[PDB]
Amino acid sequence: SHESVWNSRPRTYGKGSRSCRVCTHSAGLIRKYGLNICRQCFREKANDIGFTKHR
Amino acid sequence: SQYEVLPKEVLAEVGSVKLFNRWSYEDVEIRDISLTDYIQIRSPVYLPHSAGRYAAKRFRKANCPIIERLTNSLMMHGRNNGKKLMAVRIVAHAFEIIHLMTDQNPIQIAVDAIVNCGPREDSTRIGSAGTVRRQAVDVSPLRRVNQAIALLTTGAREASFRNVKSIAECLAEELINAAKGSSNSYAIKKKDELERVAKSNR
Amino acid sequence: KAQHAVILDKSTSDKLYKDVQSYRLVTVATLVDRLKINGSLARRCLKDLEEKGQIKQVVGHSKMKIYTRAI
Amino acid sequence: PGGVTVRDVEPHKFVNAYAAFLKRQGKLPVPGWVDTVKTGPAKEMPPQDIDWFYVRAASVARHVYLRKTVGVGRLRRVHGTAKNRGSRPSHHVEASGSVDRKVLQALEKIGVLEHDEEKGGRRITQQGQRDLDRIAQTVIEAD
Amino acid sequence: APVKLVKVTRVLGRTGSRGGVTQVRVEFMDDQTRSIIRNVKGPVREDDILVLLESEREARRL
Amino acid sequence: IYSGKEFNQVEIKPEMVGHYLAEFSISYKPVKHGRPGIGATHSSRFIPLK
Amino acid sequence: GIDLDALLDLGSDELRDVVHARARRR
Amino acid sequence: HRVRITLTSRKVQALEKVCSELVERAKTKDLRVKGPVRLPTKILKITTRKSPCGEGSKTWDLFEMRIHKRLIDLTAPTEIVKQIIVNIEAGVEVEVTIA
Amino acid sequence: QAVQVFGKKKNATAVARCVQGKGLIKVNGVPLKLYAPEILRAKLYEPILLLGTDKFAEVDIRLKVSGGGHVSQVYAVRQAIAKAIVAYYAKYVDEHSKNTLKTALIQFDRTLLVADPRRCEPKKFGGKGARSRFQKSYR
Amino acid sequence: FNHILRLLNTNVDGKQKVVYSLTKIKGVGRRYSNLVCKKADVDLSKRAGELTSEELERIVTIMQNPTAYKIPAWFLNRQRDIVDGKDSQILANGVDSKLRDDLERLKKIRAHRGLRHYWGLRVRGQHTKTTGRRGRTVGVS
RNA sequence: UAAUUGCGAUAACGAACGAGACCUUAACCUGCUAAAUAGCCCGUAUUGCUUUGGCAGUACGCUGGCUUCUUAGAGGGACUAUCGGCUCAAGCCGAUGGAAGUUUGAGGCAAUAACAGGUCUGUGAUGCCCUUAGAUGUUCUGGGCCGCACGCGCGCUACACUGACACAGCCAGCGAGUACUCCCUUGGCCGGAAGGUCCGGGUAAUCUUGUUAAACUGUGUCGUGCUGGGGAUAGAGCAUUGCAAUUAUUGCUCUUCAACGAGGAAUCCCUAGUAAGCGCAAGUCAUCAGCUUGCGUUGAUUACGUCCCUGCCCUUUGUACACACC
Ligand SMILES: [Mg+2]
Ligand SMILES: [Mg+2]
Ligand SMILES: [Mg+2]
Ligand SMILES: [Mg+2]
Ligand SMILES: [Mg+2]
Ligand SMILES: [Mg+2]
Ligand SMILES: [Mg+2]
Ligand SMILES: [Mg+2]
Ligand SMILES: [Mg+2]
Ligand SMILES: [Mg+2]
Ligand SMILES: [Mg+2]
Ligand SMILES: [Mg+2]
Ligand SMILES: [Mg+2]
Ligand SMILES: [Mg+2]
Secondary structure: OOOOOOOOOOOOOOOOOOOOOOOOOOOOEEOOOOOOEEHHHHHHHHHHHOOEEOO | OOOOOOOHHHHOOOOOOOEOOOEOOOOOOOOOHHHHHHOEOOOOOOOOOOOOOOOOOOOOHHHOEHHHHHHHHHOOOHHHOOOHHHHHHHHHHHHHHHHHHHOOOHHHHHHHHHHHOOOOEEEEEEEEOOEEEEEEEEEOHHHHHHHHHHHHHHHHHHHHOOOOOOHHHHHHHHHHHHHHOOOOOHHHHHHHHHHHHHHHOO | OOOOEOOOOHHHHHHHHHHOOOOOEEOHHHHHHHHOEOHHHHHHHHHHHHHHOOEEEEEOOOOOOEEEEOO | OOOOOHHHOOHHHHHHHHHHHHHHHOOOOOOHHHHOOOOOOOOOOOOOOOOHHHHHHHHHHHHHHHOOOEOHHHHHHHHOEEEOOOOOOOEEEOOOHHHHHHHHHHHHHOOOEEEOOOOOOEEEOHHHHHHHHHHHHHHHHHO | OOOEEEEEEEEEEEEOOOOOEEEEEEEEOOOOOOEEEEEEEOOOOOOOEEEEOOOOOOOOOO | OEEOOEEOOOOOOHHHOOOOHHHHOOOOOOOOOOOOOHHHOHHHOOOOOO | OOOHHHHHOOOHHHHHHHOOHHHHHO | OEEEEEEEEOOHHHHHHHHHHHHHHHHHOOOEEEEEEEOOOEEEEEEEEOOOOOOOOOOEEEEEEEEEEEEEEEEOOHHHHHHHOOOOOOOEEEEEEEO | OEEEEEEEEOOEEEEEEEEEOOOEEEEOOEEHHHHOOHHHHHHHHHHHHHOOHHHHOOEEEEEEEEOOOHHHHHHHHHHHHHHHHHHHHHHOOOHHHHHHHHHHHHOOOHHHOOOOOOOOOOOOOOOOOOOOOOOOOOO | OOOEEEEOOEEEEOOOEHHHHHOOOOOOOHHHHHHHHHHOOOOOOOEOOOOOHHHHHHHHHHHHOOHHHOOOOOOOOEOOOOOOOOOEOOOHHHHHHHHHHHHHHHHHOOOHHHHHHHHOOOOOOOOOOOOOOOOOOOOOO
């Protein structure tokens, strides 16, 4: 709980800094255009965002 | 006519189309009448490099010039795949060397070599579940041209492998030996052994 | 392992200067077999004969060169 | 009658002709390490010539002549080659910016090229274009 | 025995287990009244010229 | 020096200058091979059925 | 390449120029 | 004054009509209009593995979003500009540059 | 008097202008005899060899070729030149001669005039190429 | 001429050119022998055999004295002697003799890199399951 | 017929899915629309040879016109069109024209029924069970996931002369890029290289960027030698990213120079811009791409057939099978 040791290690970069903005999942994250959404959750919300299959 | 865009070595042969600007096609005949319709020499070509669609679909490669076909066969193995200009360079150097060796028309030598390397009898493998039996069958004219081009090129290719004898002047003697009918040619030996096996399996 | 000489001694020099006239084609490979000579010296020999006017060139391509007798 | 420029001359013959002209003149300054470097990490062996720098200067000068402008970065990309990275696949790698930079500075000193403060890089000069045209003329005279 | 040449009249159809051999109707140029059937390996079409070695055997399905 | 689970006593020598302290405390120990198991080879993973 | 007596009393910057590149970066 | 109108959207039919409608009312009031300009389309591609667990045959998704950007050059004072683009439908964007 | 044509092969395209005047053909300023690699140059002179060498004596042709590979750009140049002379002898000359020149190109090589409609097949997943598939092992 | 030469402590072929004949001296590679020949004012076209004995002595001495002949300090295969602190280019018999010394120093301090060498394993962090493969089966029984 | 695709026969008639149809993309338009964030022509100024007309010539408010090339919208275009055959039909073959005549090429979508297929380690999606202050929650240091007798799978580099190396020539396309902090980076300067530094451009058809990619072509060196092929293992030094480089992150310089000379029994992929060779961008990302997803360059041999092997679809037939020939 003490601020010096609690979560002391910096998180400027790495997979610990970034997580899915809807399901806090680190692996398979999509951040090509600032989406910051894991691949599993993106497939559900792809049509809502404006992504569609054409080919 | 201020600027003459054509080179002097090109303007000298305006009259007729000559392969590599050196050799003509009129004095080239075929001893075997069967391969006349499947060897394209009625239409002269300057270079053995055309982006023709000769697989759309069937019997279109017959109309392909036989010099085109020879060049395609050099670019065979993986390191040589996709290298047509190098094959053209090798093929061009071969005919001129044949001309110096024989003092004949090199196209006449190449056509004679291709005619002499085509086996006229082969055997297909039949039987029942590994009981290997062979039945002697005839060979179509189109396959004979394909077989001759394949056999000629592989012998030149393997001979040049790990040998000081360079590929451009290697290919020359197999074309020369085959036209001469020499038994030292690799294609002649494989052609004869295929026909010998086929005769056994008649 | 055929040993190809890197120095043209008296025996090979005289053979080269007396037999190259009758050779229809004078290539780097042709000298190596008929003279047992290194390729680099074979190429220099081809240049030397050309300077003497004893054989004429057909191919000036860098990657492979053709020389033939002139009579 | 004409009347000819660098365009109507084979580049292989032009660079050799201009390399001899610079070497015969001897005015072109050369760095001391010309006999040491191998012109880039992508290369394996140093150049097989003592006169390679004069050829490089001639080749670069023609390049600047034919383009609007060029700097050290562009020429590194142009002169870069594929690197033999052992068992890993080859990749394109730039080539020894110091060699290119010194060539540009030397050509600037002898008046062939001049710097452009509005666009960056270096461009051909009136004397530079005049000098190359004379060399191209001699090539046809040699032909 | 001498070799002889023939002209392909009719492409009867494929044969063999794997369909790599074709049966063709065959006539002789020297004897226009003689017609036989032979098996051919390779792409064949009508009005082709074929070379037969010891043309005595009659073709059979493979 | 702490090596994973326990502290290893290392005395610094003048020849030890220029190296990390992790050099002198191994963390994995050498591998002394034993005997292959059932799934070590293709011809040994078959379990008999009686 | 420095004797042990002066090596232990050597200054930081002088220590820097001698040590390995990785040591220098640290 | 020269003002540049930038129209960025995703629906072609919506963009085509508003581009036509905006320029059509421009001639009616007799202004000098240069355009419209059809900039190259922008295709946003996202390739994703279909399976959420990595099991099965490898099948991949290709989600594509098309962005269409249009330019209109108008020669009119800013007072006119605020009265010429009053009715713009949803799904499209309008940008102005003063020159 | 001027006409504009273009030739295509893969991504390589070559835009050509035919201008009345002294007979000269230039590719990106460089003369045609010195543009292409020497082994490919026989292809470039082929349209002129097929036609009359004096039929290009009254035209000024300049090309600007880019977009593809070195081999493809050669095919773009040769096709554009053949179209340029045909266009000139159609607009400014009676098409009977144009018909005579067009056929001379046609019964030799159709590619001299009509562009080859072949492009790269798009890649599919599961393999390195359009048709090739990754190697698989059943055991 | 002069088919066989003797330089430093290695036999040298005379039929091969100067640079690649000198590469057989271990501790000298293709590039290092190239600079040495250029610094020694010796023609590169002629072979190593037909060199004059005065050329040989010029070539050898410049090898053990690279710094004295304006050779850049970054060709040297040791740029900092950890015991001496001086650049040095090491010839045939020295690298093998010196290689033990570096291994001896690493071993006597019980460092990880020296320990890996003594055990006989990869020392540059390589993976060692499917690619060591020294011996043989070792079957299941 | 690719097709339960149709012609037809007909105790069936009339329908619904799937196929097709449909959508995306590639190839055509010198027809329309209109472009200073794309070009061309014209003219102005200027450069070099010729000076006798020709050069990527060079120069955004240097510019009057146009849209062939480029961009992108509406449209047109192919429907087997015409011709010669077979046939009652469905259709099939060849030739001509045409950019295109395998459904024009390639994809997306894709039916009923089911698997005890995979995922509880994507989810604040969850039932039950377990644990819940010495935690199986959470956080911090270090280590490990890389550890090495051995077997297997996907790949990279190679065994060279159709080659290696050195110079010279020298052509793409798909895309990405800066806010609470630096993303793509130009040009100038220093250095052998990796790199360092300074002024700046770009929130993007504008700048990186024509990403001058590699393969490839030309002229030379080498030479049939496990050799200038091959770059495995290893030693030394120098920088970069990171708070941290040791079990070398990676990069560069020198040196060390292993097997390997085309590969057994077996086995994989593939029919035209295809296989194969070659590289580039994106994802991962502070750094690392021998991986994948796409893109382009060079560009073939051989069928265009069959049910012989391995499987699939329909009908007839046999069955002691139904957990269905494992
Ligand atoms: Mg280059
Ligand atoms: Mg491929
Ligand atoms: Mg389709
Ligand atoms: Mg789940
Ligand atoms: Mg936990
Ligand atoms: Mg931890
Ligand atoms: Mg796999
Ligand atoms: Mg491979
Ligand atoms: Mg090279
Ligand atoms: Mg481009
Ligand atoms: Mg990357
Ligand atoms: Mg991966
Ligand atoms: Mg029964
Ligand atoms: Mg039962």
